[PDB]
Amino acid sequence: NQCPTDWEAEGDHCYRFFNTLTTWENAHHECVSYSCSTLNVRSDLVSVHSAAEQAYVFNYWRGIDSQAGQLWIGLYDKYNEGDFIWTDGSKVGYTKWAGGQPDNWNNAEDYGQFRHTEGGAWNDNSAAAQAKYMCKLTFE
């Protein structure tokens, strides 16, 4: 375990859950703010690439947080409506959409989040909504 203190290790990554309500854009900035250019470490909202990473992220979050609510992740379609990508540039092979999602409700939902139910099934929500958030380190 070579993760920074207050960050959890799993695979080739470190993860850290922030138990504070905020907007997706603010969460994005807060995660990116933990980057370290001298060590080529890129910090970002969590990206999710397998059922096992989903489960990991979900169980880490719900292991700390007992409140009903959502968890921002780095999935978004801001720049191309309908095409959800990761902020960290990683490829989009894994999805876990909740039934009826993504629905771009009121033509204003471009930001992805886990629900606290159904193993962390994903919803698209808006720039005004608030949720907790999870950051991930990528050692480039």
* Cα 41 from Cα 50, distance rounded (Å): 22
**Vertex 7 angle, CA 127 and 10, to 5°:** 100
Tell me which residue has tokens 């999805």: 95
Lookup result for tokens 């886990």: 114
Smaller CB distance to a second copy: residue 45 or 75? Answer: 45
The response to whether 44 counts as a known ligand-binding position is no
Q: Does 67 bind a second copy (CB under 8 A)?
A: no
State yes or no: 110 annotated in a binding site.
Answer: yes
CA 75, chain centre distance (Å): 7
31 binds a second copy (CB under 8 A): no
Residue 77 annotated as lining a ligand binding site: yes
Q: Which amino acid is at 38?
A: T
Q: Which stretch binds a second copy (CB under 8 A): 12-20, 57-65, 66-74, 79-87?
A: 12-20
107 binds a second copy (CB under 8 A): no
List phi, psi (to 5°) of 136.
-140, 135
Number of residues that bind a second copy (CB under 8 A): 22
CA 117 remoteness from chain centre = 16
Asked whether position 77 contacts Ca ion by CB under 5 A, the answer is yes
Q: Contact positions toward a second copy, by CB under 8 A? A: 1-5, 7, 9, 12-14, 33-36, 38-41, 43, 137, 139-140
